[PDB]
Design a protein around this ligand. Sequence first.
Ligand SMILES: CCCCCCCC/C=C\CCCCCCCC(=O)O[C@@H](COC(=O)CCCCCCC/C=C/CCCCCCCC)COP(=O)(O)OCC\N=C/C=C(C)\C=C\C=C(C)/C=C\C1=C(C)CCCC1(C)C
Ligand SMILES: *[C@@H]1O[C@H](CO)[C@@H](O)[C@H](O)[C@H]1NC(C)=O
Ligand SMILES: *[C@@H]1O[C@H](CO)[C@@H](O)[C@H](O)[C@H]1NC(C)=O
Ligand SMILES: *[C@@H]1O[C@H](CO)[C@@H](O)[C@H](O)[C@H]1NC(C)=O
Ligand SMILES: *[C@@H]1O[C@H](CO)[C@@H](O)[C@H](O)[C@H]1NC(C)=O
Ligand SMILES: [Mg+2]
Length: 1911
Amino acid sequence: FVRQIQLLLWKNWTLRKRQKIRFVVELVWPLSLFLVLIWLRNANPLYSHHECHFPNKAMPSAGMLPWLQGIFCNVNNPCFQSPTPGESPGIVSNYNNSILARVYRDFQELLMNAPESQHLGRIWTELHILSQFMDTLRTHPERIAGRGIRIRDILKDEETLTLFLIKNIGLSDSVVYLLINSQVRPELQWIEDTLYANVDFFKLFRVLPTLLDSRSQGINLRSWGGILSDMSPRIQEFIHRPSMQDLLWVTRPLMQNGGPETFTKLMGILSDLLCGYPEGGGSRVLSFNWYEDNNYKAFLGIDSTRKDPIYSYDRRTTSFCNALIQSLESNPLTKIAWRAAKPLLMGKILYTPDSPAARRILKNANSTFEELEHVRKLVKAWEEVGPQIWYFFDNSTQMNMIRDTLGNPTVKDFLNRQLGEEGITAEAILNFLYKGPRESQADDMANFDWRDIFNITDRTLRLVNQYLECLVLDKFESYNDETQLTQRALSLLEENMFWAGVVFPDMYPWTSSLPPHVKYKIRMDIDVVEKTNKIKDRYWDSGPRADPVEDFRYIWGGFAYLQDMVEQGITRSQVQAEAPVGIYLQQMPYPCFVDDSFMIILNRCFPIFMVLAWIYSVSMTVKSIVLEKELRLKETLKNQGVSNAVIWCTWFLDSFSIMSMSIFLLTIFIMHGRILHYSDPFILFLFLLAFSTATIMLCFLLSTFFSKASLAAACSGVIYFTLYLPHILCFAWQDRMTAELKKAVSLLSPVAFGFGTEYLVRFEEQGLGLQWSNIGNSPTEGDEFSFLLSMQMMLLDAAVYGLLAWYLDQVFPGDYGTPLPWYFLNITFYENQITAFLGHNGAGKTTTLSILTGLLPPTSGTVLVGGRDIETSLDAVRQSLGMCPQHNILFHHLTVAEHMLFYAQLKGKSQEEAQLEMEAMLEDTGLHHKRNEEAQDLSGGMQRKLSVAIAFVGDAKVVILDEPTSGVDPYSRRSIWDLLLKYRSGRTIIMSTHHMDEADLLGDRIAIIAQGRLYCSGTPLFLKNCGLYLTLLDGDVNELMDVVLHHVPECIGQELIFKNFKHRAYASLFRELEETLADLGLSSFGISDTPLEEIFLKVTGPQLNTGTQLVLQHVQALLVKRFQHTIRSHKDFLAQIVLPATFVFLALMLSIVIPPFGEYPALTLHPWIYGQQYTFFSMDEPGSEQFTVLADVLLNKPGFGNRCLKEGWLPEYPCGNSTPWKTPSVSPNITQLFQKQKWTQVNPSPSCRCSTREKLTMLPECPEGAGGLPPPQRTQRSTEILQDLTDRNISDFLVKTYPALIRSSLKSKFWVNEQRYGGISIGGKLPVVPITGEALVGFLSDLGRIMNVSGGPITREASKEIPDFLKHLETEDNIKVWFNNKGWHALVSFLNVAHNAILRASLPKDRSPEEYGITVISQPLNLTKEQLSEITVLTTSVDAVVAICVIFSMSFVPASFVLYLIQERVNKSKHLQFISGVSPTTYWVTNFLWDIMNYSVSAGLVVGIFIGFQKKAYTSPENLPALVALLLLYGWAVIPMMYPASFLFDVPSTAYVALSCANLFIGINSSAITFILELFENNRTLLRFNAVLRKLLIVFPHFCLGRGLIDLALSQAVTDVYARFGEEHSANPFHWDLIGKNLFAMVVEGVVYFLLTLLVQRVRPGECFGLLGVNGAGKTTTFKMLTGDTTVTSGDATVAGKSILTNISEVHQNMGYCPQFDAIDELLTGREHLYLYARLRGVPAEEIEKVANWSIKSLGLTVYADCLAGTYSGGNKRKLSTAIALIGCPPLVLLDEPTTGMDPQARRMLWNVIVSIIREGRAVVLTSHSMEECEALCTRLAITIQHLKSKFGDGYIVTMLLPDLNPVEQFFQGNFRHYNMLQFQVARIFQLLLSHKDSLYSVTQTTLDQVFVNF
Ligand SMILES: CCCCCCCC/C=C\CCCCCCCC(=O)O[C@@H](COC(=O)CCCCCCC/C=C/CCCCCCCC)COP(=O)(O)OCC\N=C/C=C(C)\C=C\C=C(C)/C=C\C1=C(C)CCCC1(C)C
Ligand SMILES: *[C@@H]1O[C@H](CO)[C@@H](O)[C@H](O)[C@H]1NC(C)=O
Ligand SMILES: *[C@@H]1O[C@H](CO)[C@@H](O)[C@H](O)[C@H]1NC(C)=O
Ligand SMILES: *[C@@H]1O[C@H](CO)[C@@H](O)[C@H](O)[C@H]1NC(C)=O
Ligand SMILES: *[C@@H]1O[C@H](CO)[C@@H](O)[C@H](O)[C@H]1NC(C)=O
Ligand SMILES: [Mg+2]
């Protein structure tokens, strides 16, 4: 039966290709969402970074110098691709390439390790010291061997020349002594100088300056000269070394009046001066996960900076310090860094107990601050040592002696021993003592001397002293309890002088001795510490989480530093021993990650968008199927011979074709839009095609539930969207499913699509992206769901949906034969001419018809020559065809020629045969001229003509019909008669209807036998004889009637009514009547024969109220009506009482499930806050006993942390058992790889291949090697696995095994256990200076003894504790604490672990380390008002979403009202009420009143729901009336707002969906815009915001309600905030500033919209007039003009009798033309027996409680009177409509189409009621399209029944074996075709022929049917 598929598919394609709006939308709308996705993809570029190795971070326990150097160097936390030096096992110092370190290295290499130069330098040192000692006069304490007491010796004073001299024989004093005395003296004399005795310059003899030291021998030799010129080559090599040259080249801008960049270039110089990091100084990685901190300001671009503090005058600092603070805070450039650094530099630390134990702990922790104070004192000592240096370089006596030695004749070696050694001798005179005391002029000092550098060094020292004085080093303030703290801390945070509060619990103010286990809490500001309510990063981000400022609050906030200080103080308090070990937190290395945030969107937006891509489409598909079912058109196909599965097969082919085109376009769009980079387009195409197939099965399944096309189209999209939501619910609980409950949930197609696209996103994060070889593999490596199973089970869902849809369609059809069980006498009449079976409906005629249809199986009878339809179902289905039912069976959009082709090819035939048949159109249907016209374009007569002609498209021998012309136009009835007669073809045509006139002329070979038992055969000749009436204002015809009655032996007004033919008597009466016609007033004459309808009948105060008594009664009636309509209807109950209730309940669930945003409790800060993890251990320096015992007390005895304390640490964390050491088993080829190949230290293991710029992977693909040879494991007693990373490359192992660890964890990427958060490397020795302090003090004292600089109080105070300063400057023994920053509280917890290990290692022999420990707790202080503002913003955003949901829920009830109103308006029920006498004002007022009542009930229910939650924001006593007012007034204002939607729209379900969408859109926009634009505190949009709030959006009641709820939430939040702070709040609604504005706006807007709605609203007494003068003219327009439906004045002048106006009755408009029953059932279809009550209580007018008395209106039908109006059939419905139309006894009765399809008996009852009414004296005017009903019901008035026939061209019709007909024809021709019946069209000859009947029958005049103005 493939031809059926082909034909139905062609039909479906032809209908689909003509809509031209669904076609384009179904292809464009899905593309728009993915264009949005493309834009999002372009707006979210991926962030890729290389391998990250981070520099070591020192701690205060490691000494001031490493700690500060780390602080300065690692301000950016740089990423180095190569491992840092600190990551090596034995070394910790990354400052190896710094210029200072290299200069120090060269200093040791050349000077310290010189060739025994130390000995020579020392010898020179004691040489100078001995010379200085000899320089001292020491009064007379001299050896007296030589006259050298004092004053440059006294040789002249004491010698042999004293007194008279002459001791040496002939000694003379300046008298040219012949003999010179030399025995008593160590060394031509005359008065004149330069003589023979004065030949020597100074002293020729005794040139040695030693002079045996003048005491105890020890003469100073030339050892100083020997050392001289030996230091010169080494000094030159040191100076010319590249390190020293680099030092000079970088230091030139420094220490000068330069600094071109005040801070940018200074940092650049200081970096390579102190840090010297490789690469370009490293690079920082940026943390983009702003949503993890709830930092909405960062996303929106708001500044998010706290308010600046006040100047606070000067405080206790210096003027320079205050100026610096004010400049730093005021400068916008440097206020952020200064804000971060101020608590550290100048802040206070507060401790609560104030106990002797606490004071001891803090004194021990003070070490860093004593060290800083010592540095400050050392710098301050310059103030009193600098002038001494300057004076020493002034005269003094040492510098003068040096100058004299240089000033000696030739200065011994004038050119120096090291001649030409780049050093001039004048450098000892100038540039060292230039110009003596002072320079002669500016720049005359050779520009470089002692003072030239003295100013620069003095200025630098004084400036650094000034800067250092701006520091607070007495940071510890003692309080009494934690209540006094957090109050001082609040003020300090206000002025930014608070570091932390170190509160010690479990210890009283009098506690002196420390407990073995010490707990303490560090209380920080929440802005400088990680939040304690969250420990992980939620959504796992590919990245190291290593932004220096964004996610290192523990470092730069001072938490880690203070924790280290406090724990070190506790350690020193407990152990009472010197075991100095530092801490070197070192972040774990990270591999080549790729951060693609767009995947998040792709993980959430891709499914929903796809669903939203089909919503409209799915609706249309359903709108097709139900449209084939509601139009009784699927049953037409089933009668035609479809299989009930070929139709759905073709529906699939059509829908699948359109969806396949759409999916092809979407796949091309996605691939070329770079939404998916690394995916094969074919698998994505197949995934989308499987989703499409599941969607089409959803369409088929949903089409069975519904029976109305419009409702199905409106609601199918709603079900389709709703079905996806379970996926959203399951995504939050993704870990809950165990691949079995997930399967159960995924029976829904959207949920399975969501799972599949989740797997797609997971594969797209990698470089694979759903290839053919990985669809069946789950990337999580632990889930059995996979992705291929997703597509397969979506196909399974499609099959299940289709099967269940087929089952339901078979079992629950619309109206047809249904197999409820779970399956999965009689003869033939004449066979020629147009036979007609006439009978009452339901009396067996329909049963005989159905038996003849073939539907009911034939029993003991033959439908045709085939024997039986039961015996031969295939036969008599092609010939016995053309089944024309009462329903018009056509297509909405298909063409007439297309109908002909489709129906000709459906019943056999072929395309050529169908085309040939369509060519023979047999005229009609506009011939071939109207071929291109669509079926809907054709008029009703044309539509029915085509429907009947469709029966003759195929060659059909038997064409049985059912009312071909039941309600067709009279001209159209003639046309259909001509078409049907022209297609007789000798066929057994059978037609059945209640219209006998249709069988009068076109009916031949009549057989009215369907009477239930075939009582009468009813052949036309036989039916004729089962008498004739005579037709002819004078009023005297009563006497004339007797004459005619006597001549030929039912009278009414304006007319005359009165075998065995009696020709002689009849002809005599006819001649007498014709002769007397002139005398009488009759204009014409006629003859009436026996009607065919009668043949079938053979078997069968004032009562009226006036004035104000109306309106009140009016409203009651209307109220009552709607009351009934809201009791019978249950849809109006679910759409008004529960739907808002359920949505509000869901919204409140959402509100209460969200956790509070500002809890921040105390966190115990231990590594086991993360459950299962690997912690690693490295042992370096095994020789040290201290490190061995530290490893012992770290590994097994107490273990890590404090979980094992021998006395119970935490009940929630018990201690288990420790497994023995075990190296994990490894694959054989891994060992082969590691043994066969060569691996060096630089390349110890295979390298992970990360992103290659063309295949970007989230993490590198690590080969089988990775770290390699897994380390031994222990499964520590703390239920955590310890790895032994001893003698192994820790950095390589970590960075290459991290991906393997994290692949297992990231099964969901929502709460990941990285299984590795920290580790300990016990080792790393920092080289220290060998000065040892005391030697330095001795050297400085000796130097100060050489020249009397001495010192003062400051120098002595500085020198008191130099050895302690040197000891605390740096720490030699150290331990590294590796931490993973992706765990937030990781580094602090492992500081705690390391300090516990250090404390346990230092314990004495006794006092077992099991019990000792330290516990750190992070408990942030109470939030400030600025932070509480953000918390309030978050909470009120949740409340705003709740308010939006409340608006959306409450908008349903007014929508239900609008659907009621539109349903009442469309079916003209509202117009009927207006016609009866309901004024528009009264109608709208009572509708508004009832709507307010219903909404009040619904809002009371919603208020009950709210109060059931005890929400303080809304349900508090001061807010409950507010919430009630908001709800009630919102409804009361929004109901009139959408009243006009009744006029705008015409379809109820469409109105519901459109109004719900509009309300949701308006509500979300109104709430969100005002809630978001108010967040921008400092902007120019605020005015814009106000232009949105006060004026723009206040018009919408949605905005009023939403802003009211939001403002209530904000007011309650701020009231709670002030109550927490104790300031209290007014909290008074109805103030016009909080909520009163919205209430007044609602009050005004309700009235305004109600007025807008009211503005939108803007014949003789006894003769029936048949208003059918022109059929083509719009009589419906005339009736509307006579009624209130149309106000067009372009019409004829008419009056209602009582009043005359433009609208006839416009002058009065009261109780005029009361009935207006048109060709429409103006029934509410929900009220029973109340129509006669509603249409009488006051609606026509109040009849004074006479409702029961006026029960006569129930004469037509009393059995169905008490049943629902929609419950019973159309005949009873229209009988009730007519009864309520003429219920008020009006003078004028309007009737349109007086009787539609109804039983002839009921039609007779209606006609007798009408004629009785018109005889009573009530005027009736009637119109009809059948026009057969006008006869015998309407009076002489017509648009004269006999007069019209006579005036128009017409005449009487005369009707009379085979040879016997010849005499009749010959006789008939004498006076003036079919077998046994002659139809001759034709007065004197007629009378004569009647008398001559024997020589040769019934004769009737022209009827109203014949010649109905054909023109
Ligand atoms: C104009 C654009 C130009 C620039 C281009 C950028 C455009 C691209 C758009 C984004 C580029 C980057 C992609 C990041 C977002 C894209 C992800 C997406 O699209 O879907 C999300 C929707 O999730 C939700 O919104 C609530 C569910 C959270 C459940 C947590 C449970 C407990 C927490 C409850 C607190 C909830 C507060 C109440 C929320 C009220 C509703 C807003 C599914 O999150 P996920 O878990 O699947 O992924 C992990 C992400 N982690 C947290 C996600 C968010 C959004 C945190 C927002 C945090 C906030 C404060 C959101 C909104 C804000 C609040 C409420 C008040 C201030 C105003 C503001 C609107 C800014
Ligand atoms: C400083 O030296 C000068 C130079 O001779 C000399 O007057 C004296 O030693 C000092 N000057 C004083 C003390 O004014
Ligand atoms: C090593 O052996 C394992 C399992 O025996 C296998 O999966 C892997 O592919 C092998 N590798 C090589 C290089 O043979
Ligand atoms: C050093 O001693 C000299 C004399 O020997 C004296 O003039 C000078 O003031 C001293 N310097 C001091 C005490 O700083
Ligand atoms: C901090 O908040 C707690 C929470 O209950 C409160 O008890 C305490 O008094 C607050 N301290 C202040 C506001 O100083
Ligand atoms: Mg972050």
